[PDB]
Amino acid sequence: GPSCVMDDFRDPQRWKECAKQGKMPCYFDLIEENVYLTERMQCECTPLSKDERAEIACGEDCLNRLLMIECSSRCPNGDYCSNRRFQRKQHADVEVILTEKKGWGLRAAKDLPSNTFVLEYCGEVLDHKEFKARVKEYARNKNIHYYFMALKNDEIIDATQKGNCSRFMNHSCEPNCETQKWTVNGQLRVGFFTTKLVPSGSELTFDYQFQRYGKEAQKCFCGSANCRGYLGGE
Template identity: 55%
Template sequence: MKDSKPTTPEPEKPEIDAEVQERLSQFEILKENMYLTERYTNKETKRMTCDCFLTEEEVERGELGCGEDCLNRLLMIECGSRCQINDRCTNKRFQNCEYAKCEVFRTEKKGLGLRAAQDIEAGEFIMEYVGEVLDTKDFRRRAKEYSKDKNKHYYFMALKSDQIIDATMKGNISRFINHSCDPNAETQKWTVNGELRIGFFNRRFIAAGEEITFDYHFQ
């Protein structure tokens, strides 16, 4: 009788935290903001084009354009369809959902949080904060309703003076980013195709496994 080859046991799959699973099921994932109020578009910024270009040699070498010296990028405006660099433009991070890999986890003292699942270099885009965009009237109504449920977590962020993003019922995992007085990330407001949008950007190098935080008071 021939000896059978020893089988290699399959690695155990990490147990999914029940609280994380439950909280993730409590809201609908959105890829972009859902407007429940008037949607403003700034036609001037939508038409703005940068002066970036690539030479034939740079194109042949596979180089990319619209980097740190891009006029639009310096003004916190994403390039649009008129960009001369076309598909080599690197200033379309919101539009292309170029998010860093992150995961929701249970923190020691702050409930659930968001941590990096990869190293993130300083100044990089982490992800967009998305949700339902409300006017001030609906915001006040929802805030009053949410306050009646003491166990309910709610997530508001001001987009403009008269528009608030509510990620309580619809949004993405950026809603789990916690506050810190010494944060490693910050929010920035960018204009994308004439619309204002909010993104998280890291202030310094963030190592894989490190919690992502920002200062709520300076959102």
């Protein structure tokens, strides 16, 4: 299948013409951060010494990391903090590919260890009313793909028009990634993390959970032994 790299999405001109030759996915508005449609301290880690750096600054036992909170610039490890990954776009090396049946997908360019941050899932943040409106909007238009992720009560990310390359991650009944919900400046975000070692060339997948709506659920083509046959939480 045609591949491309995250850098390819930076040139919209080169992208729009790549898309017409189907060597790239359909155009969408690229964003490095979530957009609210309707508008809405620190850890006690011990500052590591610099030859200790040759131990993890803000590791397993960090008060913020334990609450899935990122540190700010005011972290007692300042620059050396390993818990600012979302903020520093410390994304994994991932390519975008055409799958047999699922549309476009993500694959690992290098071997990703377990428990590795992949990408933030970015989009427009909708309330429940905005969501329900859009689902019928999209259904009405006979859209083939759906890009919704539950963030919390009355907050659902919609990657349909605006997002980044996280929106290409396909669902699998038997996945190699999970979502983790992380707090950054008192604002909740969501990102993909490997749950095991993902060999280079491998498609990244996660187990999409989401309350079902309507009658015709999308069929799963994951090919897993334990395939539930349908996408959604049901």
